[PDB]
Symmetry: C2
Subunit: 328 residues, 2 copies
Amino acid sequence: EMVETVCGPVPVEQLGKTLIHEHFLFGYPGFQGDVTRGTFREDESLRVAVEAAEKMKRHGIQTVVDPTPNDCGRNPAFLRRVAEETGLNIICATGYYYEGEGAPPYFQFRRLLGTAEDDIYDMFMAELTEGIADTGIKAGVIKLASSKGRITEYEKMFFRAAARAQKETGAVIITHTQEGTMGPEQAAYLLEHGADPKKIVIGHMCGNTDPDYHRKTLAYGVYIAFDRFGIQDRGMVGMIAPTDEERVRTLLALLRDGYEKQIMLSHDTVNVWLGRPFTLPEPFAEMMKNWHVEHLFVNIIPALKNEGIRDEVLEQMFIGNPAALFSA
Amino acid sequence: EMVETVCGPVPVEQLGKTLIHEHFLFGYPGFQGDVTRGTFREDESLRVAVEAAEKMKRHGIQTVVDPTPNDCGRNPAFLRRVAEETGLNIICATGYYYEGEGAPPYFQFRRLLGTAEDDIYDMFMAELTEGIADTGIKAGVIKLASSKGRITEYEKMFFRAAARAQKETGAVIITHTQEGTMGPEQAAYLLEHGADPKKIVIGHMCGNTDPDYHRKTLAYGVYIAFDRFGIQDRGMVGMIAPTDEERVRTLLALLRDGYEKQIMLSHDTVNVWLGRPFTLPEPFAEMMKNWHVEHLFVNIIPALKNEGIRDEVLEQMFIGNPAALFSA
Ligand SMILES: [Co+2]
Ligand SMILES: [Co+2]
Ligand SMILES: [Co+2]
Ligand SMILES: [Co+2]
């Protein structure tokens, strides 16, 4: 009945309206090496993060899960300052970024020592139950991710460690999938290893526009997240994301099938980029103009209500699902 | 006449006896994410590093080049504290780790933005001429590395940026080669982009055991470094490295061939590992039993003198070559 937040344990019944995937700070691994030209401006960053939090609060949001991975600039103390300033509950994660073009050598080195999976498991337990770094702050979720079209051997170490930690703690697992792939594979692999489907959120499911893919994932009993609202088409340099229009189409088909108790919604904003600032060129910026923490509320919700979605169903997704997810 | 150290500019004539590649601190990229169970032990680390510096001083060493890359735990403030304490000159680097399993998310994102190569140049220039972070410390070398059998695209950006920065500043370039490949190609590539061979050290050359490969590299006018004495066979569990007896055989062929003015020697020790402590299994710990900062002086040099290597040849390598390398 409690969940760990950056301000300590909070009753799950008090989380209220929740955004399941948003980043106050985020940096792509490697940002740390660009410290000279890409210094962290903590005061200015706290201001921007506090403003983002207040914009969420504008729409009744009481809780945010910020699943920034350990190698992507996760900063629990900074998050505590945001929470203390705004009264928002913020839940952070323990986890590493997916492999990408290739695995970082640290845990690859330890795999060759034969201890990597055990070390990762130990990291998860420490961070879920003892405290992160120089603080007593505990993570409330394990963050996993897989690559496009495969869960790599590197990534599987974290999946196995997460299932183990999940069994010991009852902690929630949040994932990120790359380019609308591996949703069924993620669920199947975690479930093979004894993870509880009612404690799993398969992320970035909005990146696939085929409801049959969503149904194949939903059949495992897991939650899914349409968590990149506002990231449209070629707006971000990485991939080609779907449009919001396509997300909404996909979502409405699932809500019409009555899957509302398995779906959560978010934007995956990055409110402060770590490392050196950058700009997007004119036409793509236009594609990203709605990528902000209010978008779901001021744009997506009214579209859904005009399409016949009731407040009961919306509140199931924003309130009921997070409460169930984080409950025993 | 001057080189930037962690204690500011120092006359090159005062560097004296030098180790061209040793790490006080090092961690594999990713170590930062394992901070909870792999804390930086500030007290113990300074003790172990200061001691390492004392051991080097005891065999006459006055200067150490510590080329720990930016993404591998480079900490110029900490190195300054070691220098302020022991009087040892420490020269640090600006650069990133090699690909090899895949480019890190950060400069890969920037590569997609199209600004990466320029950002890297800008970083080099800033860290060579202005200061690293808030430390006021300037790097005295640019550190580059390439992958096995190939200089990749990610890698070439750093090579071209280094050539460019070397032209502006006259800074020294130190490289690392992976598993005895690409020595000639590194040299060729840098020179093709305007770099000065008298300011380049091609490293880990001891990883190759074919003197033809060395001669091909030496033909470009660059320095080469046998800089991994003590790292034997499969001891570092990732890769296969030569034995020291293979290094000596190779080195003797080159010394017989009168190459002393282009050769430097080192151990590439890691005196404090960043991230979580670990233990090498007992077969590999044996292979590595000589990997420490005194190995050259108590074991390798004696062996060389017994095969007729003269004091003035050794002094050319440890004293004259660094002096020439850092001189305009
Ligand atoms: Co993600
Ligand atoms: Co995210
Ligand atoms: Co190296
Ligand atoms: Co090294």
